[PDB]
Amino acid sequence: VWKDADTTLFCASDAKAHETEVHNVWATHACVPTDPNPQEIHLENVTENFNMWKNNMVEQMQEDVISLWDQSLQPCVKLTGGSVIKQACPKISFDPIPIHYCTPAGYVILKCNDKNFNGTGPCKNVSSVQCTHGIKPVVSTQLLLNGSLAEEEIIIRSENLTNNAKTIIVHLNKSVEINCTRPSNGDIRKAYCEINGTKWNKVLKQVTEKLKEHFNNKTIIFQPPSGGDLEITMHSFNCRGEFFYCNTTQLFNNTCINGTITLPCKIKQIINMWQGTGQAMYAPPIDGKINCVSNITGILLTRDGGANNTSNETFRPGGGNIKDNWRSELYKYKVVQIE
Ligand SMILES: Cc1nc([C@@H](NC(=O)c2ccc(-c3ccc(Cl)cc3)[nH]2)[C@H]2CCCCN2)sc1CO
Ligand SMILES: *[C@@H]1O[C@H](CO)[C@@H](O)[C@H](O)[C@H]1NC(C)=O
Ligand SMILES: *[C@@H]1O[C@H](CO)[C@@H](O)[C@H](O)[C@H]1NC(C)=O
Ligand SMILES: *[C@@H]1O[C@H](CO)[C@@H](O)[C@H](O)[C@H]1NC(C)=O
Ligand SMILES: *[C@@H]1O[C@H](CO)[C@@H](O)[C@H](O)[C@H]1NC(C)=O
Ligand SMILES: *[C@@H]1O[C@H](CO)[C@@H](O)[C@H](O)[C@H]1NC(C)=O
Ligand SMILES: *[C@@H]1O[C@H](CO)[C@@H](O)[C@H](O)[C@H]1NC(C)=O
Ligand SMILES: *[C@@H]1O[C@H](CO)[C@@H](O)[C@H](O)[C@H]1NC(C)=O
Ligand SMILES: *[C@@H]1O[C@H](CO)[C@@H](O)[C@H](O)[C@H]1NC(C)=O
């Protein structure tokens, strides 16, 4: 006795009110305390359809992250709507915390428990929950960081796998640590991410093998981004308030597809805002060692559509649509109004 519907969700977290960290600060006034003992009810013989690509939960999380970033990450110079704006741009404490999304009274969240669910279609194993799992609003491109892993086999997620214009979401089942560091001491913007080539090249081959199963045994080739802004041509992310730009060619160039893979990184001040508000400029990198060790739990790829009768299918690290990042975690939920 329920139907698919959209409504105003609310967030919950374990943020500290005393902290100056931006995520904790935002969650303190925007979210409520997390439920100590949340309940989950498995619906008997209930089957439901899901669509991670058409989920209002994604838009709502998007609006929250945009709100947090607009309040916390303000640039020195801004350019939006043909208006140059100067303002204060002090360094901040930045480190994403788990955010839960819940439904109000008269509404519930359906959770797909199919251990091989790809994001779209029917789900045989469904359960009822008030909130989602703790999701860190990590903004990045190409690589999904600090997210959840696929329980069983690797999963390929796409709204339309044949459409080369539709982005693909790779859900890894084994995290590959990416250790990025801007050493205390030849540019201050020069950084690097270390990835164990053995762990990575093994996972990438598995990703290569499963893609073949989706494209009828066609040859899978990984190549660097064909073009576009640096935000999508390179693995971009925020580390301690700094915008890291790392070349991932050594990751997506077929050589071992065995030691330490060192990716060249740049800490850029001039950036294109993912909010779509234009470009912005921030102050130089902070002093001391800047380190961010993350778990590579997902991969954003874009397939070339210049091959019809060929025996090859080329894939490149894509993204840009940050809403895809929320989709990689909000694929297994959907809001329904109880009747
Ligand atoms: C109106 C509009 N213009 C956009 C340009 N792309 C970006 O602004 C962008 C993508 C990724 C990031 C980024 C930055 C920092 C971090 Cl830490 C992580 C990610 N910024 C497109 C527009 C078309 C030519 C190519 N660029 S997107 C957009 C909708 O929001
Ligand atoms: C359904 O999902 C729940 C939670 O993930 C799990 O405990 C249960 O074993 C699943 N049922 C089947 C038949 O796999
Ligand atoms: C990464 O995953 C490991 C387990 O493989 C875990 O111990 C660690 O806390 C994770 N780090 C994150 C999520 O930042
Ligand atoms: C991850 O999935 C692949 C199939 O894509 C499988 O071969 C591998 O064993 C899985 N890893 C784990 C830890 O289950
Ligand atoms: C996802 O699963 C549904 C249902 O099995 C199927 O119709 C769809 O083609 C699948 N898509 C991908 C990308 O696997
Ligand atoms: C998926 O993309 C292909 C390629 O453009 C297209 O022919 C097909 O109609 C698309 N599927 C849907 C359901 O629109
Ligand atoms: C990351 O790499 C640095 C070297 O720049 C090293 O000192 C540090 O211990 C590494 N961290 C992890 C978690 O491996
Ligand atoms: C990354 O480096 C490779 C080789 O060093 C180069 O071919 C490629 O163009 C670089 N990518 C970007 C986005 O600069
Ligand atoms: C990569 O992982 C293996 C274990 O799988 C380990 O023995 C090796 O030392 C790691 N590489 C580096 C550079 O530490």
Ligand SMILES: *[C@@H]1O[C@H](CO)[C@@H](O)[C@H](O)[C@H]1NC(C)=O
């Ligand atoms: C992932 O989590 C770890 C531990 O909280 C943190 O040090 C790291 O900066 C996070 N990665 C990103 C990209 O925020």
